[PDB]
Write a protein that binds this ligand. Sequence first.
Ligand SMILES: O=C1CC(=O)NC(=O)N1
Length: 224
Amino acid sequence: RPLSELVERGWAAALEPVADQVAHMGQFLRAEIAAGRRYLPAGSNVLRAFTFPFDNVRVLIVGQDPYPTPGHAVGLSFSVAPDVRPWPRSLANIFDEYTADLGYPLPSNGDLTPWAQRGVLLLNRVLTVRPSNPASHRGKGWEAVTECAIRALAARAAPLVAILWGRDASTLKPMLAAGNCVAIESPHPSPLSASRGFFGSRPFSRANELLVGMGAEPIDWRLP
Ligand SMILES: O=C1CC(=O)NC(=O)N1
């Protein structure tokens, strides 16, 4: 099943260097189901961030791992289905920093699809997880794929703001040093990290200033 049949053409051209690594992950995920070990998100959502145009990404948000709880992970980092309540704790924290920063009402639901439609790539360093076992798919070979994806967005001769949430900041800043790119970091919005530097980081209106700075359009961050 060639990438072109799983992701947007731009992305498929961007990810040809790791097309094998991608196929190998499909074998891994197949072996996981065979062994009675489901994964999240759903197979159709695993590469979903790369379903929005490679050539339209203005802001890259990089997390760690998909939500480990069944019903949560939808293949856009931090996003959940429109009817999901309560929200996952990372998303609740994000939304509070959202209203602090931008002064907009608390969003209705946790569906971050509007951001994806407006050039925000919602990326996780690792794109699958064993349910109720956080970070369980670290080291399984996603890292090569997300690094090629990040490296490819940086070499793209267009403005990019990277928002590096959590332990992958110092690993990802180097891939993102380029005249057209700025990487801003904070501790992860997860409950244990969020109090020591996520709250008050005002990343959304920082991102916008850096864009307007680079002559590019600001993101409209407004969620219904
Ligand atoms: O809880 C979560 C969900 C996600 O998509 N990305 C993260 O790093 N943390």
